[model samples]
Target: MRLATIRTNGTTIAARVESENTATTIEGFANVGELLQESNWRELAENAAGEAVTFENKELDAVVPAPKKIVCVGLNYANHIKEMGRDLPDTPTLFVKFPDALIGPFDDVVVPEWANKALDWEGEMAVIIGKRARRVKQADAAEYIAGYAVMNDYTTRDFQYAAPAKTPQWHQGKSLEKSAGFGPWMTTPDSFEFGGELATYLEGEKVQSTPTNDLVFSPEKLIEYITHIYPLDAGDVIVTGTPGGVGHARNPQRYIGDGETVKVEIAGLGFIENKTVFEL
Candidate 1:
């Protein structure tokens, strides 16, 4: 089943997308993040029925608008790590994105002209946690996942490299508000598998394309690894890293600036397209 956070009647509700044009709202739940807190969210969402909405003009908010935590893995793709001139590490390189940084799948990516100088894209897949998890084993980690969504990690290279010291650590470049291209919805695991293709496009040109099977750290492993350090609550998100074709790794360093569009998509999960708008 596909779950979405949709906006209508001046309010947002967690909903199950019954079809391309129809959705059944799960009332009392404002977003997928709230819905996931229920132990029986999967069943609640599946059997939920409230207001019916059409896709005509409704807004699909970020699938989980206010996740408790947004964890991202860096350099998890072997080829991408190599492209960045880094060797594969024994453990995952993790980073965090504040929930305020998230934007709807189709929202405009507003960046100031100065910060837009080196806007780059990192196409990725994200896993959403279904339940509280602490020190879970890799073999049992799958049980804690609620679903998957496509993500585009929009990095501001200028600020990222502007840090005084040599250690930028990715927090500045990645934490800009409304920069992360998140979900149109979340696809439950029963509907999506790892063999599909994930791709990123800039102005209709494919810049990154790879099979989902290439991640050095799978979702299960990441969950186990992370849960060992701190507990992950329902509605937390984990973004699997991108493949090698990121603009930062491209020949001559290509980037998308003002008035451009960036798109990220996973095989069956769905796609998000955000236009770069230069403004205050």
Candidate 2:
């Protein structure tokens, strides 16, 4: 089932989608993240008889709203890699995204000129964990998956490169508040599978496009690898990674200009469209 967190009555509530433009509120839960923390989230949402609401004009919040941890995997797309003897890495490159950085799907991505000069977008499918998992075996990884959602791992290339150490300035460049777009909503695992069309668009142009199954390390692999490091709690997100054609890799090196809209869509998982607004 499609689920979301929506803003209403000066507050947000977890909702179960009932139609393309409608949903039913799941009372008592602040958001999907809070709802998932309960072992009976599926049943809770299924039995929801709360007030009905429409999504057309409502302000949608992040699907999970406040996941305790957002584990990101980088360089995991198999088909997007340069074929120059690029043997697949033995392990995944990881990073962290604090909850403060998250913004609703339809929310404007506020970029401060001071913090963003080379803003870029990375569209990916995010796996949502439903159960606590530590050292989960790859074979048993499916049990912990709640479902999936679409997220744009927006990056500030300038801050990312400004670090004297030079490689990955994850915390500074990747954690800008409201810089990343997450969730129009989240879907249950029963409705989604490993692969389908995953894409990114700039304004109205398709910039990055690929099938979701082209990952060098699949969701189960990432779950197995990551759970060994830190226990993944319910509502935790694992962004699978991005495909090629990032503006940062362009010949002249372009960036998302102020006032441009960026959109990320994955088949069956829905899409998130966020406009960029430059702030002081």
Candidate 3:
């Protein structure tokens, strides 16, 4: 089942996506994060009675507004690293993005001029955790997956790679206020096979496209790898890495300019489109 967080009269509520034209707000849950924390979130979503929400009027909120953690992977894709002139790593390269950076799927991505005028995009497939997991085997990891969403790991090129160029300054480089583009909604795991096409468009041209299965470490393996370090709670999210065509790697180095639109779409999961704007 597809689910979303929507805004109504200044309040946000979790809802189940019934169709393109309507959604039913899941009663008792203020947001998807709260709902997932409940052991029976799926049951609640399915059985709860909700108010009707019209698609045209419904305002989409961040799918998981305040996830406990937003774990991200870097260089997980084969082709992506190949183009960057790096050898495939044996283990997953992880990073973290704080909740402050999260925004609605279609919200405006504010480019902080001082931080970076040359913003770059990394479209990735995001996995939302359903069950608490710790040291779970990669084989048993699927049981912990609740759903999937599309995420744009938008970055400020200069800040992302500043002075100490050799080592990645991930936190500051990645977690600038409002840099992450997430959630049109979350597609339940049971909805479709995990393998799907992921494509990113800058303005209107397709720049990066790849299959979700192309990851060097699958979601299950990532879960296993990550949980070994720390526990993953129900509302935690793991964003699998992006594919080859990022603007930073281009010959002339393309960057997201002000007044441009960026879109990331996953064939079966869903998509997110955001407009770039200068932060005043």
List the candidates' TM-scores in order.
0.95, 0.96, 0.95
lDDT of 2 at 29: 95
Candidate 2 C-alpha lDDT tens digits along 21-59: 789999889899999999999999999989999766338
Tens-place lDDT per residue, model 1, 211-243, is: 898788999999999999999999999999888
Kindly indicate the candidate among 2 and 3 with the higher lDDT.
2
- In model 3, the clashing pairs are none
Candidate 3 CA-lDDT value: 0.86
| Tens digit of per-residue lDDT, candidate 3, span 54-99 | 7542278778989989998988877767767888899888888998
- RMSD for each model, in Å, please? 1.7, 1.4, 1.6
Best-performing candidate as measured by TM-score: 2
Residue 32 lDDT in candidate 1:
94
* Candidate 1 overall lDDT versus native: 0.87
Better of 1 and 3 by lDDT: 1
Clashing pairs in 2: none
| Candidate 1 stretches greater than 4 Å from native | 56-58, 79-87
